[PDB]
Design a protein around this ligand. Structure first.
Ligand SMILES: O=c1ccn([C@H]2C[C@H](O)[C@@H](COP(=O)(O)NP(=O)(O)OP(=O)(O)O)O2)c(=O)[nH]1
Ligand SMILES: O=c1ccn([C@H]2C[C@H](O)[C@@H](COP(=O)(O)NP(=O)(O)OP(=O)(O)O)O2)c(=O)[nH]1
Ligand SMILES: [Mg+2]
Ligand SMILES: [Mg+2]
Ligand SMILES: [Mg+2]
Ligand SMILES: [Mg+2]
Lengths: 157, 156
């Protein structure tokens, strides 16, 4: 489950971090988003018929999804997403955005090449992946721990 | 930094010797696998990582992922029953880098995958092109032979 309250906190956590990066820009953020999608997808390992038991540990799957959510939030922030949009977007946590596991990669690249990345899809997909394959609370906990870590790493440099 | 048909034919035989040990081998999964290794390799370049002072993973890591991409490219070529005619005509497609520079290779790769899919020629071509343009052919072949040896030992 996900409230507008919770989503608003997520975006605030992301903004606090992104404000510490002067070179921050949407082009790189969108490329980075796509790359974390494949980092995540490579932890699920649906296609690896050469492994007896495919799939990396749950905490590893969640921490890449957390990475993907980070850039989705950042895109929505940098794009100046409005409350009006967020509130129309939450009742869409019951959509088939994550598609099915066998088509999600293909689908993802199609939407990217054709339509590009907008604030709504970039936010929606990692939340919707979490709702359908994990839990939203599992993702939020992974995400909060990761950003604290990211902050501690930025202090070093 | 040259590639002969003899060399390419040796790589294909190396790839088949490994793939014959994988009874679940199928084209659909190999194509998905190929796309994923592309992004594994792309993420070793870290060109987009403005939040890093010194972006880029070590050379051995970049080459190991480029070797993975060559592996699935060779595998796709093998499963598709690639012909001598096609290989000998493909080698003249080294030379011309054409397509991608570094700031566009991700978007270029995805465009091609979506619009054309993965064919025997393109999937084999790309990692050889990349080796020619950012590393050397020799470096990729050496990295590929080390990786496959590790792969076999892992299947043991
Ligand atoms: O502008 C940024 C940059 C990075 N980040 C965070 C998100 C994510 O947790 C992480 C992504 O950066 P990296 O790709 O460097 N980390 P990752 O763990 O994915 O390393 P790698 O790509 O090597 O697997 O940094 C932001 O939130 N905003
Ligand atoms: O059918 C196959 C399957 C795998 N392989 C080899 C190629 C490549 O070197 C490697 C790819 O399998 P993994 O993705 O499981 N290994 P990788 O190094 O990419 O690990 P990871 O995906 O976790 O980064 O196994 C084949 O040659 N044919
Ligand atoms: Mg990353
Ligand atoms: Mg990551
Ligand atoms: Mg891999
Ligand atoms: Mg790899």
């Amino acid at each position: 489950t996900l409230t507008i309250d919770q989503l608003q906190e997520l975006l605030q956590i992301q903004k606090e971090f992104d404000d510490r990066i002067p070179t921050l820009n949407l082009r790189d953020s969108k490329i980075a988003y796509v790359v974390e999608f494949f980092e995540w997808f490579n932890t699920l390992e649906t296609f690896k018929n050469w492994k007896k038991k495919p799939g990396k540990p749950l905490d590893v799957q969640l921490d890449e999804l957390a990475d993907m959510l980070a850039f989705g939030l950042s895109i929505a922030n940098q794009s100046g997403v409005s409350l009006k949009t967020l509130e129309k977007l939450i009742p869409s946590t019951l959509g088939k955005v994550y598609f099915n596991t066998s088509s999600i990669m293909k689908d993802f690249m199609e939407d990217f090449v054709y339509f590009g990345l907008g604030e709504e899809d970039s936010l929606s997909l990692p939340l919707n992946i979490a709702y359908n394959l994990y839990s939203i609370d599992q993702l939020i906990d992974a995400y909060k721990k990761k950003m604290k870590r990211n902050h501690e790493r930025q202090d070093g440099t």
